[PDB]
Design a protein around this ligand. Structure first.
Ligand SMILES: O=P(O)(O)OC[C@H]1O[C@H](OP(=O)(O)OP(=O)(O)O)[C@H](O)[C@@H]1O
Ligand SMILES: O=P(O)(O)OC[C@H]1O[C@H](OP(=O)(O)OP(=O)(O)O)[C@H](O)[C@@H]1O
Ligand SMILES: [Mg+2]
Ligand SMILES: [Mg+2]
Ligand SMILES: [Mg+2]
Ligand SMILES: [Mg+2]
Lengths: 344, 344
């Protein structure tokens, strides 16, 4: 693996082979490549426009270097993020409903834009987001749910922290985290932030070896099933990549005004979700349920999205309690009660 | 003027304003921009493809911080380099013949591609490549020739050496060289390795305040007058940029074997050259004459491309003697003669 040959190759706008990319990624994440060259590379890759092999290459590298646990049968609902509209922490909430009928390995980080980060609500809720791997497995067995805090499950990325911060621009590492679930979940719902990444990441995904992963991009430009209108999807499986366009009305609901689904703090997000669980905020609930319906489909638990939406209705009614047993086994329920009160 | 804004601008592939480039180049050459961003900026600037205005901005920044000497009437023959052929140092040689008729302020550096660096030959021929401004003035009056070592007349450029070396790829700075003659020569024959850069550089030079500078691209893929076929050149002055296409034959000569114009070290170049001066290397000598010919057309001491080849035919006969006096005034004549002995 010659750093120079690689760089010159990217500069000429030639895509790498999966293996070149993986060795390249491996060197960078290991800390064996001078910052000047990591910067050059990340910048070259972006201006060339990353290709499938490249994504595949880097993903495989990151999985390899990441702290792992084995729960392939699990499902994750992490999205790439980056839309920055501060919407409520949907997929996290949605991860609570899923754990009721299937092991859930929720991968995520704290907020980058705003403060509605997956790891932040869980914290605001009473959950102890920093879980050691040996414990992580125990929890998923006892409660069917664990949150895998990325910073900690991908310690190696520390060797790229300075370049990324100094560069202060989006790079290939901004859309890779969801393809790197630390527990190797084979089923997942991952939202991307642009129609273009929907095409690239689904093609990449097709080779990262999932049983079923559903990539989505919903209007007005968030990485979720769209709560106001259309949702562009890609259902990936050993069979291929299926294209599917969906409107929020297909779930049998009227479009939800998005201002209703936007938060301004972690606690505010937590309250939105509990109130949703408690039936005191139909809007957030419909948002949590349209996302869960797509996840449920990924698991092959329903025949269509409507069935998925109705089924999700039965899950949300048991989620508050579910949330309580999960947080009791790994956190502080008094914080959950406080949040509950704060929403009654 | 913010670096992060410049970076976003380039990542977006938008060309900079001359003023912007100049301030950007200033900070970089002044060593006040973090190596990480300098790497990114240089890479993006290359992938986007540099613009006439960016070239002009950097050139002006560099010129401003360079150390200078007064000799505008002088002529130079430095080329962009980087054609990857390892050919023999023709313009350094072509400069020797020129000092026979016009003061020569030759700008150059050590090789990045082989050893065939114009500065390396001289070192090998016995010349003392580091010439202080005061001494340089003296040498040009007496011998009518002087070498301006880029690494000495551009002391600030050392603030970009680590990034450039670490990168190990060509950037904007690898084409700015000949446009920043320390003696501010108003005349010269600028060689370029690609027809594309031939256009960019010609248009840029037009605004760089020259009396007459001829840019040339050699058919085989060399940045000199072609020894095997066509030569594309632009005659830029204050009145415009003329288009001109040549063939080795228009010099009344025949195609020359590039196989014999190739060198594999500083000394082989120093030998091919002296060998041609001794009239013992028909081919090397022909390659020199044709370039010299164009450079004479530039000084307007010949109004015909074949008349210049004829005039060059004279000059080479007195060449060795000139080289001899040049070396004994600023250097070690010993070396030179051992080379003569090795050229027989
Ligand atoms: O900024 P957003 O509109 O939220 O988009 C980013 C992602 O976050 C949402 O879930 P959650 O809040 O749990 O975040 P995560 O997917 O990043 O963990 C949702 O599932 C998106 O995929
Ligand atoms: O790689 P090359 O085929 O040599 O082309 C690069 C330049 O070098 C040649 O002269 P010289 O060898 O003296 O180098 P210089 O122009 O860098 O001084 C010639 O003037 C070219 O313009
Ligand atoms: Mg999400
Ligand atoms: Mg989201
Ligand atoms: Mg040259
Ligand atoms: Mg050359």
């Amino acid at each position: 693996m010659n750093i120079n040959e690689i760089l010159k190759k990217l500069i000429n706008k030639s895509d790498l082979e999966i293996n070149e990319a993986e060795e390249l990624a491996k060197a960078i994440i290991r800390g064996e490549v001078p910052e000047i060259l990591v910067s050059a590379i990340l910048v070259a890759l972006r201006m060339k426009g990353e290709s499938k092999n490249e994504i595949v290459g880097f993903a495989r590298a990151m999985r390899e270097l990441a702290i792992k646990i084995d729960v392939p049968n699990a499902i994750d609902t992490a999205g790439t993020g980056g839309d920055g509209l501060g919407t409520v922490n949907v997929s996290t909430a949605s991860a609570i409903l899923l754990s009721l009928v299937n092991p859930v390995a929720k991968h995520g980080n704290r907020a980058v834009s705003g403060k509605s980060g997956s790891a932040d609500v869980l914290e605001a809720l009473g959950y102890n987001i920093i879980v050691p791997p040996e414990r992580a497995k125990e929890l998923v067995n006892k409660t069917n749910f664990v949150f895998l805090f990325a910073q900690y499950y991908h310690p190696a990325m520390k060797n790229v922290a300075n370049v990324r911060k100094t560069l202060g621009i989006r790079t290939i590492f901004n859309i890779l985290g969801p393809l790197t679930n630390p527990a190797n979940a084979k089923y997942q719902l991952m939202g991307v932030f642009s129609k273009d990444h929907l095409d690239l990441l689904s093609k990449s995904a097709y080779e990262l070896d999932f049983n079923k992963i559903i990539l989505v991009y919903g209007e007005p430009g968030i990485d979720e099933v769209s709560p106001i209108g259309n949702t562009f999807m890609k259902i990936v499986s050993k069979r291929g990549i299926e294209e599917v366009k969906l409107n929020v009305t297909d779930f049998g609901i009227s479009p939800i005004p998005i201002e209703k689904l936007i938060v301004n703090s972690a606690e505010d997000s937590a309250i939105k979700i509990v109130r949703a669980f408690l039936g005191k905020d139909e809007h957030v609930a419909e948002f949590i349920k349209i996302n869960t319906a797509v996840a449920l489909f990924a698991l092959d638990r329903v025949g269509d999205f409507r069935e998925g939406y109705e089924y999700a209705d039965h899950l949300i009614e048991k989620s508050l309690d579910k949330l309580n047993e999960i947080i009791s086994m790994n956190g502080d329920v008094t914080k959950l009660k406080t949040i509950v009160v704060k929403s009654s």
